[PDB]
């Protein structure tokens, strides 16, 4: 018991002298009755110098009842320099699932946690499923989680973190439609990438814009956008033309066909 | 109510032109010509 | 009124709970440094 | 008056559910042929 | 009855981050007068 209460609340200079006795590592690797290490405890709580003491004595990335690691707990906590010191040990601890198979990036972006998303994502944290099949971002959007999802949209790998859903989900959809369903102004930081300008002079006459529409596609992103009564992303330039241009490309072309059929009968009979 | 006013053209702005094959008489002509192109301009703005 | 009164309130509250996240942090470092003898 | 509380998107779902219907409707090769993944725009 | 339930709501809120203002220099006296030995 008592290294688990020094190591919990980070009392350093008490895991010197009770680890003063490094004859055998049984405490330094011990249970408990939640099933937690002290390596655990100290990255639970976020203690940077503690998580570094025991992995420089001799600790083990063991797990808790639950299924957790010591990087699930720091991730939970988004204790950025506990995490920082488990990666520059073992970042071959990264990939590691729980009881209900979420990999440490599901728990960094379900509690919020921007800046802990970050380390393990810019990392090679596996991007994956959890066994309620939800990605990390899945996670991030049914808890309105602003900061990681901008986070992610930000980040060097969002063209992989898209990909990866399972499409006979009822719950889990394509993220672009969970985007607009729970985080619309996500969505309006995702399409100002969409918008290109070309010269940084408007006035010009060799000037020109260009709008990007991969993330309208799967009319699947519109009709999310006004089931969920999204007026100010209908309003938004990449929308506008996107309608425009699907209007000019066959819409016009059979509603025009459609009135002509009508439109010669109608004038002939005047 | 648009698949009912297309039956009403349809069913009357042929007897307002049977003549092309079949001569009718002229009240009956022009009674199904006032309701045929009132139709056809009602019906217009759900186009 | 609303329509920004209750802006000043996030305000209020964004400055609470900051302030809030800087005392837990003096909480967590009285555990870390306190004497403890004779409750161990 | 309550039209007018929704018409800025009413304007945009009726267009949104004619071209889907459209879609619906249309061949895959046609739409493959037509629509287009980039426009650009000279102001 | 908004027009005044935010008016209220904030002069909850507002004697709630007085309260936790004077509470802050409370932990903050603890730790200038602790005795800490051995634990350091």
Known sequence: ?270 | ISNVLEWIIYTTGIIFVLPLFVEIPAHLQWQCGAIAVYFYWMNFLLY | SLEMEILKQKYRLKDLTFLLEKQHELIKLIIQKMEIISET | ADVQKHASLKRIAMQVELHTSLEKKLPLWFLRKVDQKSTIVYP
């Open chain 1, 1 to 270: 018991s008592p290294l688990h209460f020094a190591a919990s609340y980070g009392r350093i200079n008490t895991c010197q002298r009770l680890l003063q006795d490094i004859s055998d590592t049984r405490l330094l690797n011990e249970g408990d009755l939640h099933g937690m290490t002290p390596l655990h405890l100290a990255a639970k709580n976020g203690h940077d110098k503690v998580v570094q003491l025991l992995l420089k004595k001799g600790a083990l990335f063991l797990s808790d009842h639950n299924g957790w690691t010591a990087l699930h707990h720091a991730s939970m906590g988004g204790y950025t320099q506990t995490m920082k010191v488990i990666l520059d040990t073992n970042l071959k601890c990264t990939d590691r699932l729980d009881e209900d198979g979420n990999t440490a990036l599901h728990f960094a972006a379900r509690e919020g946690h921007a800046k802990a998303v970050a380390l393990l994502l810019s990392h090679n944290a596996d991007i994956v499923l959890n066994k309620q099949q939800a990605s990390f971002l899945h996670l991030a959007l049914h808890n309105k989680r602003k900061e990681v999802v901008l986070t992610i949209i930000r980040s060097k790998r969002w063209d992989e973190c898209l990909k990866i859903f399972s499409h006979n989900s009822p719950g889990n959809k394509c993220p672009i439609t969970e985007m607009i369903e729970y985080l619309p102004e996500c969505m309006k930081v995702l399409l100002d990438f969409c918008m290109l300008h070309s010269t940084e002079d408007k006035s010009c006459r060799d000037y020109y814009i260009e709008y990007n529409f991969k993330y309208l596609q799967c009319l699947t992103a519109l009709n999310a956008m006004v089931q969920n009564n999204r007026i100010e992303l209908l309003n938004h330039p990449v929308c506008k033309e996107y309608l425009l241009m699907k209007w000019l490309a066959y819409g016009f072309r059979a509603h025009m066909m459609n009135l002509g059929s009508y439109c010669l009968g109608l004038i002939p009979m005047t």
